[PDB]
Amino acid sequence: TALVCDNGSGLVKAGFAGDDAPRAVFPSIVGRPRHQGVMVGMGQKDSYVGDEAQSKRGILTLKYPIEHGIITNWDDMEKIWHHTFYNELRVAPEEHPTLLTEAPLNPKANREKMTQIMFETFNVPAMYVAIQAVLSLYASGRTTGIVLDSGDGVTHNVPIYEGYALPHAIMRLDLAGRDLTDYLMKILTERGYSFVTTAEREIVRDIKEKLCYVALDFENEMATAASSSSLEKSYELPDGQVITIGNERFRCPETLFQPSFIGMESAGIHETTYNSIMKCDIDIRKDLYANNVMSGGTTMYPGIADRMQKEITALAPSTMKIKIIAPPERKYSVWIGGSILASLSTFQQMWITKQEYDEAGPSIVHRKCF
Amino acid sequence: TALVCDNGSGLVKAGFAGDDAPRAVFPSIVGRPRHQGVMVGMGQKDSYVGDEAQSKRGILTLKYPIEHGIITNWDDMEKIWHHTFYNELRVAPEEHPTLLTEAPLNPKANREKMTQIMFETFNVPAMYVAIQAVLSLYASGRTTGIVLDSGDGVTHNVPIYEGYALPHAIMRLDLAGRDLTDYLMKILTERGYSFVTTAEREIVRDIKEKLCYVALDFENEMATAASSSSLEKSYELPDGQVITIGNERFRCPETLFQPSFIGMESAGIHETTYNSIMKCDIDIRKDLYANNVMSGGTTMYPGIADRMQKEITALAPSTMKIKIIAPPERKYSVWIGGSILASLSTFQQMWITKQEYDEAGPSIVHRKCF
Amino acid sequence: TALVCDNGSGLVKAGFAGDDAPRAVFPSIVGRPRHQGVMVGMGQKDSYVGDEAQSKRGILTLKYPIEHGIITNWDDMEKIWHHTFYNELRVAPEEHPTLLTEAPLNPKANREKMTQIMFETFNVPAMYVAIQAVLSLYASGRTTGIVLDSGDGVTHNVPIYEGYALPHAIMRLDLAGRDLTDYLMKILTERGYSFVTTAEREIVRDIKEKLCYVALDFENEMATAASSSSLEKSYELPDGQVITIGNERFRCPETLFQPSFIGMESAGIHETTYNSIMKCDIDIRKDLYANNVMSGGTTMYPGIADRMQKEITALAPSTMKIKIIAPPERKYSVWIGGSILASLSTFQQMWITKQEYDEAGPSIVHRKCF
Amino acid sequence: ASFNVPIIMDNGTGYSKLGYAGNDAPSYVFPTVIATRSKRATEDLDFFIGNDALKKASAGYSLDYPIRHGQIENWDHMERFWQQSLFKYLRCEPEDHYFLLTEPPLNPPENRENTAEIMFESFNCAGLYIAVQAVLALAASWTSSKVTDRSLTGTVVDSGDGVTHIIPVAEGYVIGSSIKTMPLAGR
Amino acid sequence: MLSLDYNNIFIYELLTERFSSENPSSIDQVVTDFDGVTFHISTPEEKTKILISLSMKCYPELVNYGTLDLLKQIYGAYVHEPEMGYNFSILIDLQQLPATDEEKEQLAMSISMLKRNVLAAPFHRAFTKQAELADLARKDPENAPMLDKQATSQELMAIHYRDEETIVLWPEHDRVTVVFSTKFREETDRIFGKVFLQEFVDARRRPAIQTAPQVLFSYDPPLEIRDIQGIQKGDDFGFVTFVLFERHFTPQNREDCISHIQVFRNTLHFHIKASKAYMHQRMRKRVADFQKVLNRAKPDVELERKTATGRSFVRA
Ligand SMILES: Nc1ncnc2c1ncn2[C@@H]1O[C@H](COP(=O)(O)OP(=O)(O)O)[C@@H](O)[C@H]1O
Ligand SMILES: Nc1ncnc2c1ncn2[C@@H]1O[C@H](COP(=O)(O)OP(=O)(O)O)[C@@H](O)[C@H]1O
Ligand SMILES: Nc1ncnc2c1ncn2[C@@H]1O[C@H](COP(=O)(O)OP(=O)(O)O)[C@@H](O)[C@H]1O
Ligand SMILES: Nc1ncnc2c1ncn2[C@@H]1O[C@H](COP(=O)(O)OP(=O)(O)O)[C@@H](O)[C@H]1O
Ligand code: BEF
Ligand code: BEF
């Protein structure tokens, strides 16, 4: 059985091909302790990874080795893969072929280092590097659709028709759940709460999951929030202090539809989706509008399917039905899709075998993977 | 003295008939502040146009009002004509009859609306709307030749013999220097340089102008640059950071010869020129191959004359001369040709005059102009 | 005329717009007595404010009503504003508009209660609440730059280009001269000397203000003070006894460049400045790098402009010039800049007026002052 | 002259009262307030007035009151307040109707000039009467319009939201040398 | 506001009050509207009973195009004898009133919607006859051009709906064409009206709004209206034509399309006025920048320090 490992910017989702859910799901984090280690022994390690670093976060300077789907710190990244195989999945990777993933428009150097580390240190027998928004479409069980993926580090559209991607119509946008968390820290400062350490940024990341939502009509929800008590919700910090939060619940996710909130020039995810469909060749558009497959954890906000469907219906010509397809498991669907693709009997000829890496070097990956 | 404007799809060129070169050349741009003004006393201004918008661009969202040689935002095009008249040339539009310039196979509505604005908003005494390629033969001193014009927005061939144009054999292609900037921004991401904004587009336009070239054989130049640093160059961003550029130095201009790079289905500029000559009557082909005239800034890449001569010599019959006349002033040759046409003694009867417009409406333009 | 009242967290700085420098500078302190008030009569007062408290401090519990630039204690902050207007400026506040200030990224309620107390207690005729790092840029004679203001309670960066602020690139750090005072007590404790009380915290502030300086290269300064007499010198207490200090003189200021000393996870002030420049759009970064502006009393350490220029030149690309602008009057530049602003003729249109407050309520400041 | 019912507008500092001559109450009585913002330019189309502009303080508009102390003193806001009164609420065509406008006795000539050029050049109304407001208020006292119910001599004390003034009128003539005005009233 | 309401606001607000009211008062209220229309609302027999009545100069033409069957369909039991001096009248009883707050809301809407329900009759006659011609043309596509040719002259509606206008419309198997013979008599509105009508035609010729009706314009009339009464080519009229295709009046759209096409000329009339309010705010911006060009002629002197009310002050 092959491994499937979605190297996400916020969560590593990993497991075995042909299982129907990820086996490991943990923060894509390395943490090093930032304080005087006064006590001899006590189980101390020079660095903590994933759920250890999340459990001990009060004593650690956490950092993510991934920024916008690009591995920025390779020495921290080897520790995450080592932890994934040996501690979290508990299998020697030298015996099992692995399907990795990345976003479109990544640097080629990212993919070359990633394949070199996988052969030249973990000795993986064969491996592959799928485009994340192709995997999502296998999880939905479709050949035609426009995959809106938004994660922790990136948002991207790939339109695909009858199994062919239109690579000229790929739109990528470096705004995702990390930037919405840093923006939620910003706007929480106006309500009176200060979150600033990388351990406190994880509490703001947790408020974002449990309280935030997408306002179906933003300026009507602003007028409602400014004139009501019933919009507000309260959250227990790890301290037992209770915070309360209001119009800040929908102003945070509304950054996806107004990237000018975080100072960006980009059009929002409704317009960069429509600008991908309107970059396709004309006859496929009618089948893309009826198959907007959403994926990645940033699409989990309550009301994002309805706001997305309302906004694209206001851009698109009115004589045709829009359907935003939001599966209930969409959070993991890039991994679920990898679990199908790595299992397909027609796919198991497409691996990079280590014999090919041994003759060609890491530049094998560009002539074997999309 | 008449005026002449080539309202280019990316640079405005403007001046007076009988001058050797444009009086004013500036980006066909309008920019509005994206941020909030905090200083008082500062000369806060609601829109900047031309070189002032290009200079202040770090705080502006920049729009081009002409898309593929078609005016698409009229309000920001009226601003640009008001800038050409009152700020750049600094002459009132009512004083001088004025030659405008347009691409072939445009919407009829584009040339009517450009006539209605000039007579009813700028109140000009007379005007004419010449085809951009017909002016390139005046600049080149010819009466027989096939033009290959290529600007920011559009590329087109107009074949002409003894001054008779062949309007059935015009080939027009919505691929030129803008789509080469859009593609260079895309492939720059593969080396790790993310350029995204409407102002970073103007840095990537400058990289394209300073460093790119057309390689005489692409598969050979690719195999060359894959082995070596000798084809690389480096460019200092306005940030003081240096980027370094590889085979994307010449894989960018190759889009002209291989439009399938940007996904679009069309003949490259070599085959589209040969198809224009093969549509022409058989006795004139033998002279169109001998008088092949280039114009517009996208024809400025080093080696594009030798690439174009190599490809036409491979398509056309070997028994006869292929001779490409790409002159060194060709960057402005539409305007230079317009400044000759508007200066002729025999042209002064051919203007659409104000008294002759308002007895017929803007539909006069299609029955005096080509 | 209009008052300019920069109620900073360590010093109130107050005076009249268009006056040269602040005429009322005093501790932002309210002192209350802590002892058996035995002698009847004697001119005793239930609390003392400013220099009247600072001179009596040996019998008072001194407390600042303001912490990290946020008002914590309004019943004492009204006591400081009442002292400012009636005892220190000797005006009637109902006769003059007040320009107040606050640091960016403050609570909304701070700005509301500060307008409400000015209109409902001090009965002020009109008022405005400027951002302190905008005011510091007027006081530099500039319309673009990156103000590093650092006071007693807050350090913040505000990047500005052509008078537009880039609010996404504003950095706040809750570290300034009071944390350096609390750290100087923590390290003075190691040599032999204990300072504990709210009054003894002022003696060590008066050490920090004249013994301390910033090392140009801390790790080599540390070796030089550990091997020579030349870095050591002494200060004479109110009790006549002498305090001798050495590497404490530059370890204290170094907390700004290394916040890890006081247990903070953050960038230092040098890397916080660069993280603000690198958040800005790419075309403005050169004009920010050549216009860093130091301001506020924590930037008064001997050698901090030389150190700041060294550390930023190591972070910035070597291709381009760095300047740190640090006038000798940077001790008061936020007041100086408010005194420019409150005298500019367009500014008299921008005040919140009494009548407009009465009709709109205290939320008017959120839709007029930024 | 046109025969259409003259339109009547008492723009107070507090309330504008709007209607058509010969009706038994104003068609509208609502505050003299305008809600305004504080790639085409439309910030002069986005405004609201009256009871529908109090609802807008929470939607991030700034309310302002363009009449203060009985006088119009923002002419941008008052022009937009009149266009919206005429074309949304009164729903009339100015070229068909005579208008009665009202102002206090001691208004500056500049405000009658600005009122006239806005009415005649912006809206193009058929004709205008700018009545001194307390001179009218005597005629509300009558038991009916009929000549035997009139009592054309009486002091009239007017006090709105923004000005109080006392006008003596006798035998149908306003004794203008004796008007008293005090800009202290309901606000 | 960016676009006009279709209903008369006053009747909507007034009936929304009386339908909520526990204790109705009496009323007598004439109420003007656009296109020379006028309502009268009054309580003649009791405070309990509201009579709403309408006056409109072209109502005699609208009765020829089937109006009374449309009004009897809409207002049913509430229809009343026409009030003397008015064309149509409806008597609504506040004690016999519908039960739910959403029935009250839609009845107060429906009664305020009277101008566009009386002026809708020729549009429903054209839409329902185009639905017959669409079936006959689908029976024989070679006969279809001749059915269109005869319906273009036999089924044509003309309404002289105000003295400086005419609306002319006719069905053909795939469309309803409607022509506004439109004139602005006020000369400053005629000058701006040339710009507003020209830029309206030039707007339809852009990729963004191709989904809209095909608009066309001239100043002489379309060939099929050149012999209608009151249409004259020389008198400085303009002839804005809308072609509504079968997709512009599909069953979900018909009612909005009727409501929205009647208000056409009134949005141009409103926006010509609301453009003077724009040009003024843009003029007083350039005046405020010419102030700076004169201010450099005043010599620099500090005016003395003063309290907020302008009284003199003694500090600094
Ligand atoms: N229920 C949720 N509601 C909102 N946001 C969520 C939710 N669950 C996860 N997220 C956000 O989604 C991001 C993780 O999504 P994921 O698809 O796993 O990204 P990635 O693949 O790049 O690691 C994080 O920023 C996280 O906070
Ligand atoms: N030296 C050059 N080398 C390569 N490209 C150039 C050069 N000079 C200009 N260009 C490109 O040509 C275009 C401008 O050419 P121009 O003839 O003025 O086009 P247009 O008339 O349509 O505005 C731009 O895309 C510009 O970047
Ligand atoms: N010469 C100096 N050297 C070092 N610190 C100084 C010096 N002068 C003032 N400070 C410190 O600056 C702080 C007051 O600065 P200020 O800008 O007025 O702060 P704030 O605006 O917040 O009140 C105090 O911590 C004070 O000790
Ligand atoms: N019963 C009342 N007692 C006192 N004041 C009232 C009463 N009813 C209304 N007002 C006040 O009347 C004023 C409005 O009167 P109005 O004649 O409309 O003034 P204006 O014409 O200047 O707008 C407001 O101050 C309002 O609060
Ligand atoms: F890297 Be995650 F997909 F944003
Ligand atoms: F005018 Be450019 F040549 F498109």
Ligand code: BEF
């Ligand atoms: F409040 Be001071 F500016 F730190």
Ligand code: BEF
């Ligand atoms: F303005 Be109100 F008449 F006092």
Ligand SMILES: [Mg+2]
């Ligand atoms: Mg992901």
Ligand SMILES: [Mg+2]
């Ligand atoms: Mg050109």
Ligand SMILES: [Mg+2]
């Ligand atoms: Mg300060």
Ligand SMILES: [Mg+2]
């Ligand atoms: Mg009044």
